[PDB]
PDB file of C-alpha atoms and ligand atoms in Angstrom:
ATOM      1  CA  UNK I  19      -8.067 -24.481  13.332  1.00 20.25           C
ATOM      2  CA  UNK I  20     -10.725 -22.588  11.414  1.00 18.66           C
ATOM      3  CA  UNK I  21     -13.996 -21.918  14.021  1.00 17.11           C
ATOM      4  CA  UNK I  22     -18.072 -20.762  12.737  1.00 18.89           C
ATOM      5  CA  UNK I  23     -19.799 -19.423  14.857  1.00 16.65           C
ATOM      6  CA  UNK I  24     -23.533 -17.949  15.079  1.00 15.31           C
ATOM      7  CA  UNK I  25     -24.841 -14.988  17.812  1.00 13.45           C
ATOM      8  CA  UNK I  26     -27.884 -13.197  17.805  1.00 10.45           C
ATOM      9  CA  UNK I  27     -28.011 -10.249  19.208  1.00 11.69           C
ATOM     10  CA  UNK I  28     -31.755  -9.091  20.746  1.00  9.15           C
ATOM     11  CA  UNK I  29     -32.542  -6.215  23.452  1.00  9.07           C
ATOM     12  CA  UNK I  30     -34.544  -3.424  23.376  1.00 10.80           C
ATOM     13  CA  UNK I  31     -34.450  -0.369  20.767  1.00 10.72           C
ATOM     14  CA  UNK I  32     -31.806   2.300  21.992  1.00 10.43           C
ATOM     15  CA  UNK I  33     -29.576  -0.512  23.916  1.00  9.48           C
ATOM     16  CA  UNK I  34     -26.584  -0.370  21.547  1.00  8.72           C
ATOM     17  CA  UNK I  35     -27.015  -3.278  19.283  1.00 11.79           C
ATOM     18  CA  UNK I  36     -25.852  -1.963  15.873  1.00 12.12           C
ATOM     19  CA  UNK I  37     -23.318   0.101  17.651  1.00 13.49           C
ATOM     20  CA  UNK I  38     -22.013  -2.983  19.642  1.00 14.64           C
ATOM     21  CA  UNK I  39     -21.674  -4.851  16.267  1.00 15.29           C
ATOM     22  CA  UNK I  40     -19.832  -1.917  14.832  1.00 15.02           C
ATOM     23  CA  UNK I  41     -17.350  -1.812  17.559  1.00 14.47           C
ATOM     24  CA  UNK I  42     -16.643  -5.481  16.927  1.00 14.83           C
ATOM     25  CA  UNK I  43     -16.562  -5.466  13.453  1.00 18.04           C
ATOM     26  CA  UNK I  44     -14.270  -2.456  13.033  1.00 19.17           C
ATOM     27  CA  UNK I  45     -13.363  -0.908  16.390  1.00 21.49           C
ATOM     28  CA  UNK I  46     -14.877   2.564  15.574  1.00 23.98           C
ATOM     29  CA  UNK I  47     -17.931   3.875  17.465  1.00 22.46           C
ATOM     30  CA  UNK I  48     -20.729   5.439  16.156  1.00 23.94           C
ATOM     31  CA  UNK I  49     -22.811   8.347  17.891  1.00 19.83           C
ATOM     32  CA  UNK I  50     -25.659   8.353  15.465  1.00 18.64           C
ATOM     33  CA  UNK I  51     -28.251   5.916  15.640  1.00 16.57           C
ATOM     34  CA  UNK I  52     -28.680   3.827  12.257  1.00 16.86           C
ATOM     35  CA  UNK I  53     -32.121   3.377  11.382  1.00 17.46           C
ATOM     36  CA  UNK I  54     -33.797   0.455  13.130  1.00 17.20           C
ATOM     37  CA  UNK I  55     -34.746  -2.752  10.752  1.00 19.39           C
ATOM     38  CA  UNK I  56     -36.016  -5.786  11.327  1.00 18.56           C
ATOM     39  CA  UNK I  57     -33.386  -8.116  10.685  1.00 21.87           C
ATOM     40  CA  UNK I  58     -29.129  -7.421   9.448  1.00 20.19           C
ATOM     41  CA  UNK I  59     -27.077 -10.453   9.088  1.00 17.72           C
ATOM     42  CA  UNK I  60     -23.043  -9.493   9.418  1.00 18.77           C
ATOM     43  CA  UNK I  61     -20.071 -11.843   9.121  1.00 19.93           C
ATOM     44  CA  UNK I  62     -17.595 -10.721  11.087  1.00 19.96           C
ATOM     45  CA  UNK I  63     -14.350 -12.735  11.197  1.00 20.64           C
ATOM     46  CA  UNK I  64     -11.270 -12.751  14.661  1.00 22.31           C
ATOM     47  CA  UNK I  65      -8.224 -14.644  12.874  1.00 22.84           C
ATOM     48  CA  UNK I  66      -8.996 -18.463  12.738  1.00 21.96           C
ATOM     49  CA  UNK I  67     -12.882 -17.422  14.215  1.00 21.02           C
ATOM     50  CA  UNK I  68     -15.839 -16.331  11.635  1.00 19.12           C
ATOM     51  CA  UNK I  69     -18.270 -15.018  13.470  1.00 23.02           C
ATOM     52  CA  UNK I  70     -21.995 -14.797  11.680  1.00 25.85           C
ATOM     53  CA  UNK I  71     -23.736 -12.009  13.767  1.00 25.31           C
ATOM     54  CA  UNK I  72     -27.823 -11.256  14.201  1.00 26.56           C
ATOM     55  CA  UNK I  73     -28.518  -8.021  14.553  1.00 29.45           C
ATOM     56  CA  UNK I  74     -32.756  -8.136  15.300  1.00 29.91           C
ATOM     57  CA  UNK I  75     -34.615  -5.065  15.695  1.00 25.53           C
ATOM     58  CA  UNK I  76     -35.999  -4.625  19.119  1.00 23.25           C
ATOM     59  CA  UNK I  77     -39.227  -2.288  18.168  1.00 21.37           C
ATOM     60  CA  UNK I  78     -42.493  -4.020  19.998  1.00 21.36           C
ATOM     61  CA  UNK I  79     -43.436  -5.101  16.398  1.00 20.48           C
ATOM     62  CA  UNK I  80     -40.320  -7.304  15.873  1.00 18.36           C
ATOM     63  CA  UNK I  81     -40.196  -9.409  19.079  1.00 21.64           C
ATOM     64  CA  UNK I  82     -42.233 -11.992  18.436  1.00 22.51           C
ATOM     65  CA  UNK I  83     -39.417 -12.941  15.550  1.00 18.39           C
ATOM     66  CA  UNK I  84     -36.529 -12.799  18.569  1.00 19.27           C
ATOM     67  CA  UNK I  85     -37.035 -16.766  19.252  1.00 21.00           C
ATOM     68  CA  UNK I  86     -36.578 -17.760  15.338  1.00 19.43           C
ATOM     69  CA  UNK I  87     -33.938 -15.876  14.780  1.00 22.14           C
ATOM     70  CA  UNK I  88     -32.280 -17.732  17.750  1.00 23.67           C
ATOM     71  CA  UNK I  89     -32.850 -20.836  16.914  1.00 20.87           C
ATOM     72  CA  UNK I  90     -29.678 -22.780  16.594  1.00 19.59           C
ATOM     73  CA  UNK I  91     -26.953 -19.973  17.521  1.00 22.32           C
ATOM     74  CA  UNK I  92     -24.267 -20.944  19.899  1.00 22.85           C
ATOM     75  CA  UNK I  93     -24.928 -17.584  22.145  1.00 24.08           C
ATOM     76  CA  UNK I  94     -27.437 -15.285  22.471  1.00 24.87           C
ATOM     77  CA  UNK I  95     -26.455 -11.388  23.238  1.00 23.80           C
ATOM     78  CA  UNK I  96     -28.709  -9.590  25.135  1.00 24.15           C
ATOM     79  CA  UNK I  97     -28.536  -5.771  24.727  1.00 23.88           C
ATOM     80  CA  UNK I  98     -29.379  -3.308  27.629  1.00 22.92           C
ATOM     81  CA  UNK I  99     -29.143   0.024  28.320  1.00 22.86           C
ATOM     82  CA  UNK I 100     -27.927  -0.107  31.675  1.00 20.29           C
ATOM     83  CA  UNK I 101     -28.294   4.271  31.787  1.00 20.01           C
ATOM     84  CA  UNK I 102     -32.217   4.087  30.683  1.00 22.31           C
ATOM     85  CA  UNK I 103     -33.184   2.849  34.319  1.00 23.03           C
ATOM     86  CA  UNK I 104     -37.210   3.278  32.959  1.00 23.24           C
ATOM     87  CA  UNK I 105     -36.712   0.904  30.376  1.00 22.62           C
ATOM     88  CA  UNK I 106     -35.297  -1.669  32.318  1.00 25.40           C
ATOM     89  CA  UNK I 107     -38.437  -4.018  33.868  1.00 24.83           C
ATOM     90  CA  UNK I 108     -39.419  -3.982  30.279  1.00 23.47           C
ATOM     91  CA  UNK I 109     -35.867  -5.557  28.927  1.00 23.50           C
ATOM     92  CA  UNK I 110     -36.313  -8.033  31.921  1.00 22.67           C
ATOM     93  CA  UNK I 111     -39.174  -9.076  30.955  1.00 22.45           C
ATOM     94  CA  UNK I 112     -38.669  -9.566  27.484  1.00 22.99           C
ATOM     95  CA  UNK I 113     -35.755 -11.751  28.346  1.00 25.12           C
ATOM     96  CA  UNK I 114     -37.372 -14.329  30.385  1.00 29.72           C
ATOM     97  CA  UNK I 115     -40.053 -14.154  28.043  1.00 30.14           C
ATOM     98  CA  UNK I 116     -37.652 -14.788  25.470  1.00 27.73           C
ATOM     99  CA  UNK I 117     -35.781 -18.293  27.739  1.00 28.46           C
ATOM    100  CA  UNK I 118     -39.513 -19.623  28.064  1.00 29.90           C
ATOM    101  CA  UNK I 119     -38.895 -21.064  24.588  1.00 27.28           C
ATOM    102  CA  UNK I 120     -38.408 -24.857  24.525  1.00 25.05           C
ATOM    103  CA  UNK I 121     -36.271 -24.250  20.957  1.00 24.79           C
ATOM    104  CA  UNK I 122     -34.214 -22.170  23.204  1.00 21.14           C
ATOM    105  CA  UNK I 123     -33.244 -24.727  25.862  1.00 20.77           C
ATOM    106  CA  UNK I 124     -29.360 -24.783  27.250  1.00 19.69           C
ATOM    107  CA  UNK I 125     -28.338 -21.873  24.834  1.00 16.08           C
ATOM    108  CA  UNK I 126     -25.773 -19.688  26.547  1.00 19.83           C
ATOM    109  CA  UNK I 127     -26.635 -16.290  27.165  1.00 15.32           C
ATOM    110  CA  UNK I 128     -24.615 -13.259  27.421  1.00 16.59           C
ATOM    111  CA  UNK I 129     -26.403  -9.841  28.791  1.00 14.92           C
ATOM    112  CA  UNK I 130     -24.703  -6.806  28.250  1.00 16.84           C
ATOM    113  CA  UNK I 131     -25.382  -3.611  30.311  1.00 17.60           C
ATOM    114  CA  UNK I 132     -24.055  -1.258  27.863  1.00 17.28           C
ATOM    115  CA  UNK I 133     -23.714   2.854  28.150  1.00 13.48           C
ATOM    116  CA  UNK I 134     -21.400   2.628  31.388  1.00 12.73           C
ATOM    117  CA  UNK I 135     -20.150   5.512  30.366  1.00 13.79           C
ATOM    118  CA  UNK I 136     -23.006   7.398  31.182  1.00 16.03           C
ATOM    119  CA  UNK I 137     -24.007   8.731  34.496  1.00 17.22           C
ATOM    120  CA  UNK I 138     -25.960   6.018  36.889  1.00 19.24           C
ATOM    121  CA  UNK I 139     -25.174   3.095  35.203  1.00 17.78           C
ATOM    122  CA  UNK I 140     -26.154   0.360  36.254  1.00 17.85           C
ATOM    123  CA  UNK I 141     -23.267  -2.396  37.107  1.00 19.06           C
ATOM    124  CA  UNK I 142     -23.706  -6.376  37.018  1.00 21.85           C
ATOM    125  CA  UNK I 143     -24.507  -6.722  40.706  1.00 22.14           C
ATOM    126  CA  UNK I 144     -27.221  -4.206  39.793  1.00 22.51           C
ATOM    127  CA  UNK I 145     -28.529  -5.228  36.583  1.00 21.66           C
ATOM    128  CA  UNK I 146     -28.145  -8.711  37.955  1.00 21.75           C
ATOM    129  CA  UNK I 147     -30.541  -7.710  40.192  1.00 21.45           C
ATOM    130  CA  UNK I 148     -32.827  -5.827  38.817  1.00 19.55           C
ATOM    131  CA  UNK I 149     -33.414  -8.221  35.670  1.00 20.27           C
ATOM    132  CA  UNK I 150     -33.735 -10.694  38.027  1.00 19.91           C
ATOM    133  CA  UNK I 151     -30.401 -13.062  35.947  1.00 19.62           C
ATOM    134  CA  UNK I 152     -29.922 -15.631  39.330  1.00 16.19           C
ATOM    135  CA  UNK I 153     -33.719 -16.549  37.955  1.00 14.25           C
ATOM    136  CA  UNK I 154     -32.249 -18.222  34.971  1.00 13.23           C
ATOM    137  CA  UNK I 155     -31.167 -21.621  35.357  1.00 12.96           C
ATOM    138  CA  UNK I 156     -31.524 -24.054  32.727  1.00 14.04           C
ATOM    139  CA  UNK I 157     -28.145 -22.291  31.178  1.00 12.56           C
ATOM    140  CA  UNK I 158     -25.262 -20.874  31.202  1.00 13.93           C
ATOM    141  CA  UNK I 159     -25.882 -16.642  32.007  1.00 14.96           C
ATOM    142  CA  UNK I 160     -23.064 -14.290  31.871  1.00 13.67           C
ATOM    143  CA  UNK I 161     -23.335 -10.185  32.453  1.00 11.70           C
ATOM    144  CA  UNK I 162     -20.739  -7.718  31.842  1.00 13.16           C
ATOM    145  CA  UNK I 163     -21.140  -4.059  32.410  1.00  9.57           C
ATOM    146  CA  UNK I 164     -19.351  -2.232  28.458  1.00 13.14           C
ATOM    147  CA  UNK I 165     -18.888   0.503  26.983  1.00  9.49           C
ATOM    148  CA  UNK I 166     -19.406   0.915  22.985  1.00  8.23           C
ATOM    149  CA  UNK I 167     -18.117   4.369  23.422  1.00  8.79           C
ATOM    150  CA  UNK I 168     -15.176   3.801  25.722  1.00  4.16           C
ATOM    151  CA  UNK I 169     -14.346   0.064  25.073  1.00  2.00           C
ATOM    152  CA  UNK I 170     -14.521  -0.586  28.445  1.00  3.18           C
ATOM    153  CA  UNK I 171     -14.964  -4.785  28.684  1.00  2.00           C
ATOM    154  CA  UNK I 172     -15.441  -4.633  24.909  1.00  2.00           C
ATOM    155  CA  UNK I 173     -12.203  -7.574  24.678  1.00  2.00           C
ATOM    156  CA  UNK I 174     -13.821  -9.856  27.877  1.00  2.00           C
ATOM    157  CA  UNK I 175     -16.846 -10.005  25.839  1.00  2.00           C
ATOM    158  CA  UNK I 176     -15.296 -11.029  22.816  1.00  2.00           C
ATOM    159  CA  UNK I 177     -13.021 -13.469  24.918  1.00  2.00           C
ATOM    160  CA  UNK I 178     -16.300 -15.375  25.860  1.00  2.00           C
ATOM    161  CA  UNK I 179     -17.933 -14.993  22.037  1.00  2.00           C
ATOM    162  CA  UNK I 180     -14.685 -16.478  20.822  1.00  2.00           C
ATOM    163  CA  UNK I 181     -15.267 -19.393  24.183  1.00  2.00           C
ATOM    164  CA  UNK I 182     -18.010 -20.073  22.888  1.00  2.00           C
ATOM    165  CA  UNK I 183     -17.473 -20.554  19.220  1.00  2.00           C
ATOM    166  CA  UNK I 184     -17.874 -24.285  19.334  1.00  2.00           C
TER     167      UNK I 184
HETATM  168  N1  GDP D 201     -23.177   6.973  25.746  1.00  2.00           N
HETATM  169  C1  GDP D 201     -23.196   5.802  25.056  1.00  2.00           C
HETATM  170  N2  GDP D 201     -24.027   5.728  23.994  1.00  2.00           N
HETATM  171  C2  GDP D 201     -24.083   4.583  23.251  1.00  2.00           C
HETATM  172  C3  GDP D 201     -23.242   3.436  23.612  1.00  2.00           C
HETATM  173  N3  GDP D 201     -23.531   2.445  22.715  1.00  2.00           N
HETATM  174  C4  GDP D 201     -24.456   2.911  21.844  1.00  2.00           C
HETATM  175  N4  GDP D 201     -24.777   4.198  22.176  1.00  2.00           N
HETATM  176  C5  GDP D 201     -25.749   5.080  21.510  1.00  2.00           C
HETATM  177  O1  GDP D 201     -27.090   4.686  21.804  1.00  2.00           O
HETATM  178  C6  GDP D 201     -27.888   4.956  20.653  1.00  2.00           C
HETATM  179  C7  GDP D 201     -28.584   3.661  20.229  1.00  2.00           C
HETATM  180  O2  GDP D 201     -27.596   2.747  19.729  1.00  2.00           O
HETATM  181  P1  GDP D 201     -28.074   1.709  18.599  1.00  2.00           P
HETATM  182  O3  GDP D 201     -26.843   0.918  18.285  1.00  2.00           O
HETATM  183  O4  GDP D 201     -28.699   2.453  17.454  1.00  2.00           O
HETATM  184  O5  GDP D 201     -29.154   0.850  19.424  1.00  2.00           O
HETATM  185  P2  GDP D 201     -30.007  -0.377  18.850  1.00  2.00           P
HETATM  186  O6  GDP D 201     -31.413   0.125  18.590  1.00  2.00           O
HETATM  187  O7  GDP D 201     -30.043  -1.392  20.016  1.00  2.00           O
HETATM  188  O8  GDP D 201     -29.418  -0.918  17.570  1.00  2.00           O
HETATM  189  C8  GDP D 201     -26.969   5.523  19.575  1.00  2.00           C
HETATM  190  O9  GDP D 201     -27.003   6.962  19.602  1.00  2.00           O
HETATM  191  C9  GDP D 201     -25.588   5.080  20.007  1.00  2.00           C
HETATM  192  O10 GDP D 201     -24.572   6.016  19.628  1.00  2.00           O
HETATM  193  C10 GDP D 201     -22.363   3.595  24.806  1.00  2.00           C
HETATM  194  O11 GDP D 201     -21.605   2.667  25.212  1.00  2.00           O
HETATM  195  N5  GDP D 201     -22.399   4.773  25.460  1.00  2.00           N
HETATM  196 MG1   MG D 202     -30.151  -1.091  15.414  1.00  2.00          MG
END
């Protein structure tokens, strides 16, 4: 049977975001980084699944949208770049900032430590860690270290989109 889903997709600038939705959409990666914008809606459909994707821009000047734009959606996507180790107490914080919402109560979350391919990495254990995820308990949290540029764990994550596509 036919399944709607909605996802927004939040994280810093540089995680991967458009890139991530590019993968899924089409399979193809993308080296060059597509200008940032505030907001990109995307339908993106999996066989019997349509999946309506938020792509929010993750400039300073755009988070104080993130929690609107989540409103509703059956999973949140967090973005990280699990390479850019300076940048990550600053993702962290953003996130819990983010699950202090009431609107945003029992949402599942999905965070993403994406750029595995590049040297030091961080894995989940360590960006589980680090961003502090065993914190988060009012919901169901999920991490998976990816690759947009080497697919790695780019079909798990869809597997729990598509789980979660109500
Ligand atoms: N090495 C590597 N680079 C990536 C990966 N995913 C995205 N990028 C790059 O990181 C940069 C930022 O990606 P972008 O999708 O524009 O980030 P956004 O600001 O979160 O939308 C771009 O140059 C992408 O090519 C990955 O898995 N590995
Ligand atoms: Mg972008």
């Amino acid at each position: 049977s036919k399944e709607e889903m909605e996802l927004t997709l939040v994280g810093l600038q540089y995680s991967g975001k458009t890139t991530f939705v590019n993968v899924i959409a089409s399979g193809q990666f993308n080296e060059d980084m597509i200008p940032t914008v505030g907001f990109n809606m995307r339908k993106i459909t999996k066989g019997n699944v349509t999946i309506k994707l938020w792509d929010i821009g993750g400039q300073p000047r755009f988070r104080s949208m993130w929690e609107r734009y989540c409103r509703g959606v059956s999973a949140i996507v967090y973005m990280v770049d699990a390479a850019d180790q300076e940048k990550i107490e600053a993702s962290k914080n953003e996130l819990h900032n983010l699950l202090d919402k009431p609107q945003l109560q029992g949402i599942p979350v999905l965070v993403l430590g994406n750029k595995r391919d590049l040297p030091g990495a961080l894995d989940e254990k360590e960006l589980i860690e680090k961003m502090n995820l065993s914190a988060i308990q009012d919901r169901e949290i999920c991490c998976y270290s990816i690759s947009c540029k080497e697919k790695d764990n780019i079909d798990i994550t869809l597997q729990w989109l598509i789980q979660h596509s109500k």
